[PDB]
From a paper:
Pyocin DNase–Im complexes were crystallised and structures solved to 2.0 Å and 1.8 Å for the pyocin AP41 DNase–ImAP41 and pyocin S2 DNase–ImS2 complexes, respectively. However, surprisingly, the relative domain positions in the AP41 DNase–Im complex superimpose well with the colicin E9 DNase–Im9 complex and do not exhibit the twisted relative domain positioning that is observed in the ColE7–Im7 complex. Compared with the colicin immunity proteins, ImAP41 loop 1 contains three additional amino acids and this is reflected in the more elaborate conformation it adopts (right). The first aromatic residue, Phe59, forms a parallel π-stacking interaction with Tyr722 within pyocin AP41 DNase domain in a manner similar to the Tyr in Im2 and ImS2. The PyoAP41–ImAP41 complex is stabilised by an orthogonal (T-shaped) π-stacking interaction between ImAP41 Phe59 and PyoAP41 Phe714. The second aromatic residue, His60, forms a hydrogen bond to the backbone carbonyl of Tyr722 making contacts equivalent to those of Im2 Tyr55 in the ColE2–Im2 complex and ImS2 Tyr56 in the PyoS2–ImS2 complex. In the alternate hotspot, represented by PyoAP41–ImAP41, the invariant Asp is replaced by a Gly that has very different physicochemical properties. A complementary substitution in the DNase, PyoAP41 Pro725, accommodates the vacated space in ImAP41 (right). However, the second water that is coordinated by the Asp side chain in Im2 and ImS2 is absent in the AP41 complex; the absence of the acidic side chain from ImAP41 removes this water-mediated interaction. The cognate AP41 complex is strengthened by two water-mediated intermolecular hydrogen bonds between the guanidinium group of ImAP41 Arg53 and the carboxylic acid of Glu726, the side chain of which occupies the position of the water in Im2 and ImS2.
Residue numbers in the entry:
A (entry chain D): 4 to 90
B (entry chain C): 643 to 770
């Protein structure tokens, strides 16, 4: 919740999948404000330099929820940052 | 304030959303205008939702969007621009009126609408 290390990889993947499907069932402005919250939360806990770019402008091969998670995992490992909860 | 959309837009195809980060924005594609022209909208929020949903039915736009941005526009949500075109916490592509209502542009005039990145929008404002 507060940090990335509070997430297991599966739990974090659950959030990322919401950027591809309507998990919440919300529509219109309410859906947008939820996705707004998820985006800024994503940027906050991952501390990734490309921010939401990881999700909305992914590198080739990393366009899927699995790829997004893997990009986060790889970047944080490369920067000596704590990874996901085990596991 | 409810209204009726008018305008023909402008006929260009390809990565039309690439022009959103340049100049004074990219005008609304004609094939997008076709889906909006002659329709009634209860509010601007209503029009904004319908606009992106129309973008979601356009192959020329879809092909140049990530799978994530494709889902968003399919839900009537504004797509996100590249990080390079962000402005702090402002990240979404934005619909903007070229001339404001008091100068005196029309609210639902498609020919008065352009798409801009948050970064380009600030640069436009500075040039005024």
């Amino acid at each position: 919740k507060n940090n990335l290390s509070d997430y297991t990889e599966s739990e974090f993947l659950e959030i990322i999948e919401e950027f591809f499907k309507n998990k919440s069932g919300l529509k219109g402005s309410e859906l947008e404000k939820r996705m707004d919250k998820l985006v800024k939360h994503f940027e906050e806990v991952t501390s990734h330099p490309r921010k939401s770019g990881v999700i909305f402008h992914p590198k080739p091969g990393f366009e899927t929820p699995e790829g997004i998670v893997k990009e986060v995992k790889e970047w944080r490992a490369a920067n000596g940052l704590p990874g996901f909860k085990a596991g | 304030e409810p209204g009726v959309a008018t305008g023909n837009g402008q006929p260009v195809t390809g990565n039309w959303l690439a022009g959103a980060s340049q100049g004074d924005g990219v005008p609304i594609p004609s094939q997008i205008a076709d889906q909006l022209r002659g329709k009634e909208f209860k509010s601007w929020r209503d029009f904004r939702e319908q606009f992106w949903m129309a973008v979601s039915k356009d192959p020329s736009a879809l092909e140049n969007l990530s799978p994530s941005n494709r889902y968003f526009v399919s839900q009537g949500l504004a797509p996100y621009a590249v990080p390079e075109e962000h402005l702090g916490s402002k990240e979404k592509f934005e619909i903007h009126h070229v001339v404001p209502l008091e100068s005196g542009g029309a609210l639902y005039n498609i020919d008065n609408l352009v798409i801009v990145t948050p970064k380009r929008h600030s640069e436009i404002h500075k040039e005024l």
